Amino acid sequence: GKKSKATKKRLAKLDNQNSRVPAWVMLKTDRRNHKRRHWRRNDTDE
């Protein structure tokens, strides 16, 4: 499929939101990403 520049920005953001919770945030909060998506198991919008 041919993605547009806007679609691409979104897919981009989705990839980023798909990162772990930084190591330090654990310490900084005396101690989980509820939005971890998988390319196979899950399904983005559009």
Partner 1 sequence: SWDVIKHPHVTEKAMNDMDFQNKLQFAVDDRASKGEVADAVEEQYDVTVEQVNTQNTMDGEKKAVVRLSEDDDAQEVASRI
Partner 2 sequence: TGAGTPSQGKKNTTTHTKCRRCGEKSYHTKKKVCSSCGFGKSAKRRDYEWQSKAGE
Partner RNA sequence: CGCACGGAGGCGAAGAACCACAGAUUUCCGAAUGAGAAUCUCUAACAAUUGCUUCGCGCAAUGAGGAACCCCGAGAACUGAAACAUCUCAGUAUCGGGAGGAACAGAAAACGCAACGUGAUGUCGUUAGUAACCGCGAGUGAACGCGAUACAGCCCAAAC
Partner RNA sequence: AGCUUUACUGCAGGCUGUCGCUGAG
In the bound complex, what is the minimum distance in angstroms from residue 41's beta carbon to RNA? 22
Minimum CB separation from partner 2 for residue 45, in Å? 4
DSSP code string of 7-46: HHHHHHHHHHHTS---HHHHHTTT---TT---TTTS----
The nearer residue to partner 2, 2 or 28, going by C-beta atoms, is 2
Residue 2: strand, helix, or coil? coil
Q: Which stretches of the chain bind RNA, using CB under 7 A?
A: 4-7, 9, 24-25, 27-30, 46
Residue number, 5 or 20, with CB nearest to partner 2:
5
